[PDB]
């Protein structure tokens, strides 16, 4: 549903040239970024500060700054202490869930080389059984320092629920906004003989849930193949739904788009014109 | 061996219309590791000043990147996206689909 999580990417291409990224996300929308130049939290939106005070944000900066330096620099010896093979990548994500209203439902996971490696379960780092012994060896390291785990537990149990509560409220105007879609038709890669591919693009709509279907009058053409919902530079989404029919039965077909922003006035485009032609 | 290969999708923000500015998007997703080096191409040559989104990964730990640029189409212009991953024996080019 609605989840606020903070991601962490650590890429190690060789013994030199290590990469590090930290980002915050409202489950599809990036809201925070970490500036390694000055060790500060960059706010992508004015409402991304939530209901947290300015002083409260400074302590979060020092927490993330100190955590990052100690964590991201201690990897380098571990790759040599262990048998890590460059290149390797460490990914971490942690946050909390908006169940029904909000609150309970926090999480924190770590992945080595793109596979589930370890996870933090309410006071302790539990390895994934399929991850093998190396996860257990690094769970031993992570579970040693109690003070860090107490901070981590408080971060997932108190700060996250209290932050997403104010973050959603302060960002209500941006999230509840409705943007009408824009649609057009085109020709597709043209499958085997006697068959045409009809493409119906839908672009620039927010929120995400959309309805698109090729129609012949009121009859929905169930051969409609709906693709992936792709993003854009703005918070809008793009989607094209295709349909393959015989050449002689192309006319009378129409693409129909339903969206909450349209207020029930569906977009209908007809396969007529230079398309037929 | 457990490295994943990217999914490349190219699309325009608005219908193609010569002389009218538009946005070309190339969505590179579902790949691992991060070193990816995607290029947007106009008539074969590379396009400079191409913006892209911050790196992120989906739930299955595979990364996704969005590369976009502003452009104005013409009749003779061709556009494509060039991706070069470790899982590619040669760069994979996905062409923008016009009529």
């Amino acid at each position, epitope marked *: 549903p609605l989840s606020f999580h903070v991601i962490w990417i650590a890429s190690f*291409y060789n013994h*030199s040239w290590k990469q590090n990224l930290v980002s915050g996300w409202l489950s599809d929308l990036q809201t925070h970024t970490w500036d390694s130049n000055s060790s500060t939290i960059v706010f992508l939106w004015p409402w991304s500060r939530g209901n947290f005070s300015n002083e409260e944000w400074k302590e979060l900066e020092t927490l993330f700054r100190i955590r990052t330096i100690r964590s991201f620099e201690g990897i380098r010896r571990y790759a*040599h202490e262990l048998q890590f093979e460059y290149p390797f990548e460490i990914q971490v994500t942690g946050g909390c869930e908006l169940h029904s209203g909000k609150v309970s439902g926090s999480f924190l996971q770590l992945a080595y080389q793109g596979s589930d490696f370890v996870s933090f379960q309410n006071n302790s780092w539990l390895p994934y059984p399929v991850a093998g012994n190396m996860a257990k060896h690094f769970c031993k390291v992570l579970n040693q320092n109690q003070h860090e785990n107490d901070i981590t537990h408080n971060l997932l149990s108190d700060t996250c629920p209290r932050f997403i509560l104010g973050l959603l409220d302060a960002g209500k105007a941006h999230l509840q906004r409705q943007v009408k879609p824009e649609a057009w038709l085109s020709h597709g890669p043209s499958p085997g003989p006697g068959h045409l591919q009809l493409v119906c693009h839908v672009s620039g709509f927010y929120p995400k849930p959309v309805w698109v279907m090729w129609m012949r009058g009121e009859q929905e053409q169930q051969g409609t193949q709906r693709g992936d919902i792709l993003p854009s530079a703005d918070g809008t989404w793009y989607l094209r739904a295709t349909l393959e029919v015989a050449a002689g039965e192309a006319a009378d077909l129409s693409c129909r788009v339903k969206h909450s922003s349209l207020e029930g006035q569906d977009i209908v485009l007809y396969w007529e014109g230079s398309l037929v032609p | 061996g457990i490295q994943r290969t990217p999914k490349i999708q190219v699309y325009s923000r608005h219908p193609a219309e010569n002389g009218k500015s538009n946005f070309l998007n190339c969505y590179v997703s579902g790949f691992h590791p991060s070193d990816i080096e995607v290029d947007l191409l106009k008539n074969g040559e590379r396009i400079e000043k191409v913006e892209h989104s911050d790196l992120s990964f989906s739930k299955d730990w595979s990364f996704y990147l969005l590369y976009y640029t502003e452009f104005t189409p013409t009749e003779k212009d061709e556009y494509a996206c060039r991706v070069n991953h*470790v899982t590619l024996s040669q760069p994979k080019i996905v062409k923008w689909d016009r009529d």
Partner: T-cell receptor
Framework: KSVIRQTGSSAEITCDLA??????IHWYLHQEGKAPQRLLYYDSYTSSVVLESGISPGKYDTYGSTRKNLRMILRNLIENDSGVYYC???????????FGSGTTLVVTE | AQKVTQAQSSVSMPVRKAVTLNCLYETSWWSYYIFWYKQLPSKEMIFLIR?????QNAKSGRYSVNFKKAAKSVALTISALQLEDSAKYFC????????????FGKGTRVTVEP
């Protein structure tokens, strides 16, 4: 330029590399009939040593001012440590990596 | 991961002629460089020429290369052989995007017949 040591002693070679350059200075080992291979590099921005894949953490160490007086100490020498040791750093443009003067190490029982 | 090999070790060719030193590499990188270094008998390494992953055949002075990228074969050809050029020549490759180290070949000694 040439150093002689007995098995078990120590040897501190010097790096006479041209002026200051990019932060990382790598140490390579060249032996007769074998391909040169880097052993480690020195991070001047952190004044710390990072090793390569399969080197014991006590054998090599690096320190000093990287401007023409970077040192590299080898301890607990064995016979197979003999060879020419170079120090290398990349250009500012990363076009080529400069190599300093070699230092021949001879270890005998 | 990466391997660089030079098959032969000793090569001789008369002065005022041309000889070619070959180099074979096995890499898994789409962006890399190829370097040739001249090792003097005084134990000193000197850069000679650089060849890029998607660069045309490099050329500088009396140096030229024959880049067969399909089979991963780069050969250094030294034209107008002089007497000072007699040394031991090495080929190595490094990461173009993240330059860390060089994987060297085992060497190819060239002596010039006067």
């Amino acid at each position: 330029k040439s150093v002689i040591r007995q098995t078990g002693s120590s040897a501190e070679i010097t790096c006479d590399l041209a002026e200051g350059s990019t932060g990382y200075i790598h140490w390579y080992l060249h032996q007769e009939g074998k391909a040169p291979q880097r052993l480690l590099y020195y991070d001047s921005y952190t004044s710390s040593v990072v090793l390569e894949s399969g080197i014991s953490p006590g054998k090599y160490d690096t320190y000093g001012s990287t401007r023409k007086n970077l040192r590299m100490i080898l301890r607990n020498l064995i016979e197979n440590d003999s060879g020419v040791y170079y120090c290398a750093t990349w250009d500012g443009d990363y076009y080529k990596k400069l190599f300093g003067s070699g230092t021949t190490l001879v270890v005998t029982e | 991961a990466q391997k660089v090999t030079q098959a032969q070790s000793s090569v001789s060719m008369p002065v005022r002629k041309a000889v070619t030193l070959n180099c074979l590499y096995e890499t898994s990188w789409w962006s890399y460089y190829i370097f040739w270094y001249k090792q003097l008998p005084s134990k000193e390494m000197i850069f000679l020429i650089r060849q890029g992953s998607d660069e045309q055949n490099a050329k500088s002075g009396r140096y030229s290369v024959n880049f067969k990228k399909a089979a991963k074969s780069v050969a250094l050809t030294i034209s107008a052989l002089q007497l000072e050029d007699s040394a031991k020549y090495f080929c190595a490759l490094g990461e173009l995007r993240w330059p860390d180290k060089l994987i060297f070949g085992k060497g190819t000694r060239v002596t010039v017949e006067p």
